[PDB]
Design a protein around this nucleic acid. Structure first.
Ligand SMILES: [K+]
Ligand SMILES: [Mg+2]
Ligand SMILES: [Mg+2]
Ligand SMILES: [Mg+2]
Ligand SMILES: [Mg+2]
Ligand SMILES: [Mg+2]
Ligand SMILES: [Mg+2]
Ligand SMILES: [Mg+2]
Ligand SMILES: [Mg+2]
Ligand SMILES: [Mg+2]
Ligand SMILES: [Mg+2]
Ligand SMILES: [Mg+2]
Ligand SMILES: [Mg+2]
Ligand SMILES: [Mg+2]
Ligand SMILES: [Mg+2]
Ligand SMILES: [Mg+2]
Ligand SMILES: [Mg+2]
Ligand SMILES: [Mg+2]
Ligand SMILES: [Mg+2]
Ligand SMILES: [Mg+2]
Ligand SMILES: [Mg+2]
Ligand SMILES: [Mg+2]
Ligand SMILES: [Mg+2]
Ligand SMILES: [Mg+2]
Ligand SMILES: [Mg+2]
Ligand SMILES: [Mg+2]
Ligand SMILES: [Mg+2]
Ligand SMILES: [Mg+2]
Ligand SMILES: [Mg+2]
Ligand SMILES: [Mg+2]
Ligand SMILES: [Mg+2]
Ligand SMILES: [Mg+2]
Ligand SMILES: [Mg+2]
Ligand SMILES: [Mg+2]
Ligand SMILES: [Mg+2]
Ligand SMILES: [Mg+2]
Ligand SMILES: [Mg+2]
Ligand SMILES: [Mg+2]
Ligand SMILES: [Mg+2]
Ligand SMILES: [Mg+2]
Ligand SMILES: [Mg+2]
Ligand SMILES: [Mg+2]
Ligand SMILES: [Mg+2]
Ligand SMILES: [Mg+2]
Ligand SMILES: [Mg+2]
Ligand SMILES: [Mg+2]
Ligand SMILES: [Mg+2]
Ligand SMILES: [Mg+2]
Ligand SMILES: [Mg+2]
Ligand SMILES: [Mg+2]
Ligand SMILES: [Mg+2]
Ligand SMILES: [Mg+2]
Ligand SMILES: [Mg+2]
Ligand SMILES: [Zn+2]
Lengths: 44, 145, 111, 49, 155, 117, 102
RNA sequence: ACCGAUAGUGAACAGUACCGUGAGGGAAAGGUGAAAAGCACCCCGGAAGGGGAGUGAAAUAGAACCUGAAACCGUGUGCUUACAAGUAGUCAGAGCCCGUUAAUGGGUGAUGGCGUGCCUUUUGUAGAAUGAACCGGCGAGUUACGAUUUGAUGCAAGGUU
RNA sequence: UAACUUGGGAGUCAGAACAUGGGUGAUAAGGUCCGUGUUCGAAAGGGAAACAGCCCAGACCACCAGCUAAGGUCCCAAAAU
RNA sequence: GACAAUGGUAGGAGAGCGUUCUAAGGGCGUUGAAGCAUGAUCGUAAGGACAUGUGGAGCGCUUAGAAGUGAGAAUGCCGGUG
């Protein structure tokens, strides 16, 4: 129910290895800057 | 003042030997081979580096036991499952996998360290009188016994 | 040269800001702008404003190229923490840290 | 004798012993009292006689 | 101490059950703002020695001045009106070092006024001789009458 | 008068922390665990300065054994022969000679064998 | 050509021109020191002392009379409030071997 | 031969804030600069906040303003690490990277030997007995008056008020 | 090579195992209570795989020297296949 | 010079290190004090210097005197931060 020992800096960052976001899937707008793929401009 | 020579990968020269197991006792051959693999026969022995030689053991199927070891010596292994204790006799192991028999016997006489595993990887055992390492030109080696 | 902008005491926890910052570090300015525009995180418009400010500094104060700029540095430091409390059961109060960030962006032409 | 060169007579002065100031003095921790019992307590000990 | 610090009457929390260390008053010594354990208390540091030792000390200080050529006897001080410049020049003409103790037989008001403001110069009477004053001085400037009175009183 | 805590505490603790340079994680950062590890290091180093002499004598003996078996001799018999021949060369020197100059070692083996026969 | 010399209760393998570090000798820097206990002489001609090679010397020049790196000797006994810290710097003499005279 | 902002008043800016039906309890919180000269003007921004330009000896003295330790949180990278079993070090040791209070130098470290934290309390604790999340500050034989003993010093059949 | 006397200052009054002479228990207990010795306590180092109390032996510091003790010498792992 | 001794808990004895303040002497400091930070420095230990950065006005040394004089543990108190 509770941590028996505190988590070291090393273990914490090891666990955060995969905690990240990825670059959006984006494409240049041929006529109308960049946009999400399969989305309309909605602002151009 | 400190003057003791220390071998390193730049000056170590590892050779190849072939050892015939036919007519030899299992552990008596095994201990000498373990000595050879660990470099204990070299004047430049250095405990933290691998100074040993490569050993090829042929005719593993002709290794000999004394007493009633063929039927009374049992090899146990556990699979880490609740009842997973398995066994095989030394005689059945010699019949079905003499290379494993000799390899295990020798590796049991090496340290379980990282260096020990590396040094045990320099052993090649074959059940018959032929080996595939003619390119390394091994020299015949005679056991002191 | 190098141009810089800093947004201090942004009321977003640095852990969350750094996630977005990791995307644009080392990228070209236009690519970073597109990434920030299309990234769905609360930090994105704050970071976008810091980057625009850095690019404006470049152009106006140092007459830099404005099209050959890369995000040389991008980091978030910890600002002062607003200490708050949430009532819990049995008359007990639990701490809430409303953390802040200092956000820095450095652009450069590489010369 | 000058005020910048004062000297007490030999053997007339001695540094006082301060207990409970670390292990190396030999009187740290228990401060010479041993362990537990009445004589280890503050204000502890029976009346004389 | 813990009794003199303001407040601190009540037990801060019950002896058992809360999970905290047991405490008796918020003014205990280990508490911030708590009472001091021991520490300074107002007292005198004066003590006494046998009269014979006091006389021996005065004689020893005077004798040390005598050996180190720190004794200058003057005929008499002739100062009708206080003037620091005149006393300064007088000390210049007697080849005196910076630290000088001036000894007159009785309270000489003009000598005391003239020598008062000169740093390193101190004035006392024969009756007022003390070990600190003599020891601090590099030289003694004493009148004939003051020397005779000192010799009489200290034997 | 009052003596404030002052700077001596920080100076002493910082000394210990500097001694803990290179240790893992908190052991090079926090005074308490750093002090414990530096104490452990002193005790280990005291023990190991004594153990080092054993270790190196063992290494020399192993090498001398290998060299002697290269001349159809065991270590124990070779040392018995050298002692009976009055040769006082110690084990470090014997192993260094065996590594460096094979011929001189062979002559030493000849002397040891002659003293035994 | 090498020689085995005995000095400071230890033995050293030397060659001409080698710098060696030995226990402190009663000698001044710049002076010449002769080692008289030669156990073995190598090279083309090989000589084996029983225990010393009669008439053989190794001469060398003193380069330094120094003290070794500071060793902090620290021991303790856990839970017994007992420990000891001592410094140590071991004296040494540095020499350069000049001539092996078999 | 008192304190110097956790000290010294509870209180350097308060019997206030806050808590309690009430009697009553009772904090935290000092420092720009010599002088406000407290940043005209330009630029990004809704603003906040910044980058310049100025003031100033100094602006990493810009008001959350002297100094600014540690825990803790980040960015860069010289060495190293994805077959390995561990109180994390120590002794031995190649390889690589550096170059000092110039010293038989510094950083890292393949690989080998040895090795169950500390304190308390115990016959005996790696202990699965106690205590400590970490860092910092604060936190425990004192003083007065008597007694005894020792050392020191003065005088001595006297010594001392 | 101590011993005793007179003074200043203590701490200790939970002991443990092993061997041995005995009571008690059941010629049970890592039981318990006495006699005798050792060690631990307050003792690290080598041996007994690990293992306060057993065996060898009492660490002032340094050494990449040597001789031994208990215990050992086919490999792990020093030394006799 | 040549012999011996130097494991250690409770505890006894001795010698020292460092902190603040005082007296006297002698010094340092805007050509940069204290404090802080870094370093491959010195001493048998406690500990002492030097160099460089930061800092911006006080501080050492010698001898003696006096203590609110040394923290890692108290389910210690306060603050900060995991
Ligand atoms: K319990
Ligand atoms: Mg409610
Ligand atoms: Mg003691
Ligand atoms: Mg303690
Ligand atoms: Mg007691
Ligand atoms: Mg206790
Ligand atoms: Mg008791
Ligand atoms: Mg009480
Ligand atoms: Mg009260
Ligand atoms: Mg003060
Ligand atoms: Mg403190
Ligand atoms: Mg302050
Ligand atoms: Mg206050
Ligand atoms: Mg501004
Ligand atoms: Mg601005
Ligand atoms: Mg500006
Ligand atoms: Mg400004
Ligand atoms: Mg600054
Ligand atoms: Mg500041
Ligand atoms: Mg494998
Ligand atoms: Mg690998
Ligand atoms: Mg593991
Ligand atoms: Mg191990
Ligand atoms: Mg005990
Ligand atoms: Mg018990
Ligand atoms: Mg533990
Ligand atoms: Mg556990
Ligand atoms: Mg308890
Ligand atoms: Mg706990
Ligand atoms: Mg603490
Ligand atoms: Mg008392
Ligand atoms: Mg029994
Ligand atoms: Mg029993
Ligand atoms: Mg008995
Ligand atoms: Mg004993
Ligand atoms: Mg033992
Ligand atoms: Mg042992
Ligand atoms: Mg053992
Ligand atoms: Mg067993
Ligand atoms: Mg063992
Ligand atoms: Mg056993
Ligand atoms: Mg022997
Ligand atoms: Mg072995
Ligand atoms: Mg062997
Ligand atoms: Mg002792
Ligand atoms: Mg001893
Ligand atoms: Mg004492
Ligand atoms: Mg002392
Ligand atoms: Mg001192
Ligand atoms: Mg000061
Ligand atoms: Mg204190
Ligand atoms: Mg605590
Ligand atoms: Mg927390
Ligand atoms: Zn578009």
């Amino acid at each position: 129910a509770v941590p028996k020992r505190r988590t070291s800096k090393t273990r914490k960052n090891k666990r955060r290895t995969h905690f990240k976001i990825s670059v959006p899937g984006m494409t240049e707008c041929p006529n109308c800057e960049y946009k999400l793929s399969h989305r309309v401009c909605k602002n151009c | 003042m400190r003057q003791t020579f220390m071998a390193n990968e730049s000056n170590i020269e590892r050779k190849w030997y072939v050892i015939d197991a036919e007519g030899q006792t299992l552990g008596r051959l095994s201990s000498e081979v373990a000595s050879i693999l660990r470099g204990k026969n070299k004047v430049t022995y250095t405990p933290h580096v691998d100074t040993g030689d490569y050993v090829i053991v042929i005719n593993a199927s002709k290794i000999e036991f004394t007493g009633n070891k063929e039927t009374d010596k049992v090899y146990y292994r556990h699979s880490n499952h609740p009842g997973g204790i398995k066994s095989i006799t030394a005689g059945e192991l010699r019949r079905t996998n003499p290379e494993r028999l000799i390899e295990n016997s020798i590796k049991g006489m090496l340290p379980s360290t990282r260096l020990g595993e590396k040094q045990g990887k320099k052993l090649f055992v074959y059940g018959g009188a032929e080996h595939p390492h003619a390119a390394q030109q091994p020299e015949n080696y005679e056991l002191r016994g | 040269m190098e141009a810089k902008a800093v947004a201090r005491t942004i009321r977003i926890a640095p852990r969350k800001v750094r996630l977005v910052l990791d995307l644009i570090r080392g990228k070209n300015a236009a690519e970073a702008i597109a990434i920030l525009k299309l990234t769905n995180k609360a930090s994105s418009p704050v970071i976008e404003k810091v980057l625009m400010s850095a690019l404006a500094n470049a152009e106006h104060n140092y007459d830099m190229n404005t099209d050959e700029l890369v995000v040389k540095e991008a980091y978030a430091n910890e600002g002062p923490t607003l200490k708050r409390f949430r009532p819990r059961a049995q008359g007990r109060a639990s701490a809430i840290n409303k953390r802040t960030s200092h956000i820095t962006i450095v652009v450069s032409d590489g010369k | 004798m000058k005020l910048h060169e004062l000297k007490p007579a030999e053997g007339s002065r001695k540094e006082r012993n301060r207990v409970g100031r670390g292990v190396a003095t030999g009187n740290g921790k228990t401060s010479g009292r041993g362990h537990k019992g009445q004589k280890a307590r503050s204000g502890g000990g029976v009346r004389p006689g | 101490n813990r009794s003199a610090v303001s407040g601190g009457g009540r037990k801060p929390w019950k002896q058992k059950g809360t999970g905290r260390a047991r405490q008796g008053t918020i003014r205990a010594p280990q508490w911030r703002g708590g009472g001091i354990v021991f520490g300074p208390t107002p007292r005198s540091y004066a003590y006494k020695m046998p009269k014979k030792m006091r006389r021996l000390a005065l004689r020893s200080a005077l004798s040390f001045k005598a050996q180190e050529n720190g004794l200058t006897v003057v005929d008499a001080f002739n100062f009708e009106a206080p003037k620091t410049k005149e006393f300064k020049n007088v000390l210049s003409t007697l080849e005196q070092p910076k630290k000088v103790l001036v000894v007159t037989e009785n309270e000489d008001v003009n000598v005391e006024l003239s020598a008062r403001n000169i740093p390193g110069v101190q004035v006392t009477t024969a009756q007022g001789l003390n070990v600190l004053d003599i020891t601090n001085a590099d030289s003694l400037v004493i009148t004939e009458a003051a020397a005779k009175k000192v010799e009489e009183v200290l034997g | 008068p009052r003596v404030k805590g002052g700077t001596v505490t920080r100076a002493r603790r910082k000394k210990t922390i500097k001694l803990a340079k290179g240790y893992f994680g908190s052991k090079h950062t926090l005074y308490k665990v750093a002090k414990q590890q530096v104490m452990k290091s002193g005790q280990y180093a005291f023990r190991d300065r004594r153990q080092r002499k054993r270790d190196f004598r063992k290494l020399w003996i192993t090498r001398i054994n290998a060299a002697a078996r290269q001349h159809e001799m065991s270590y124990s018999r070779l040392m018995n022969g050298l002692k009976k021949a009055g040769i006082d060369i110690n084990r470090k020197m014997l192993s260094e000679i065996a590594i460096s100059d094979e011929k001189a070692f062979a002559q030493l083996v000849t002397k040891a064998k002659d003293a035994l026969k | 050509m090498f020689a085995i010399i005995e000095t400071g209760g230890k033995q050293i393998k030397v060659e001409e021109g080698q710098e060696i570090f030995v226990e402190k000798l009663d000698v001044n820097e710049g002076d010449t020191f002769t080692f008289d206990k030669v156990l073995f002489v190598g090279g083309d001609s090989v000589k084996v002392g029983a225990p010393t090679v009669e008439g053989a010397t190794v001469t060398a020049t003193v380069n330094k009379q120094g003290r070794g790196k500071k060793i902090t000797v620290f021991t303790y006994k856990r839970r017994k409030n007992s420990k000891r810290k001592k410094g140590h710097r071991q004296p040494y003499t540095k020499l350069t071997i000049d001539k092996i005279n078999a």
